[PDB]
DNA sequence: ATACGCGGCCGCCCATCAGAATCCCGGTGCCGAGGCCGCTCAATTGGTCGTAGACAGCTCTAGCACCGCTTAAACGCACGTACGCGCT
């Protein structure tokens, strides 16, 4: 909670809205959604999962089909 | 003129003397251990030095084990085609 409650305020006060990876184990990575969603659901959590076509799915959600459109920050690995 | 005799010939069983052939004992040639041997030059003997390599200490790589997330590869089965192989 302190890691989630220091990410959001570094983003809302020091103006800090650039993407920030956080890595967390597999099994850990839903409990951190659970809990992320819960105390900040303003702020998305587009983890990344899966082997093959999940890849092509984070690929296709991470930019625009064009020769950089931000549109994540926070994600686990 | 007319009737009796016989003469060697011959099949016969029956006798004598030599030759052929099997068994009882044989010499001969070939092979392989033996013996002999002898001049002698390679192993053995007694001996020194030194150095490889056994051995104990040590540390410091890498071979093992073990686990779990991820997924490519193996599995087993279903269906048919195009070869193995049999015949002529």
């Given at each position: 909670v302190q890691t989630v409650a220091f990410?959001?305020?570094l983003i809302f006060a020091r103006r800090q809205n650039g993407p920030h990876i956080?890595?967390?184990p597999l099994?850990?990575?839903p409990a951190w959604l659970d809990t992320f969603e819960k105390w900040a659901p303003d702020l998305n959590c587009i983890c990344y999962m899966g082997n093959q076509k999940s890849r092509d799915t984070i690929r296709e959600y991470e930019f625009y089909t064009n020769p950089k459109t931000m549109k994540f920050n926070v994600?686990?690995?």
């Open positions: 990410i959001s305020w956080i890595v967390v099994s850990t990575m994600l686990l690995t």
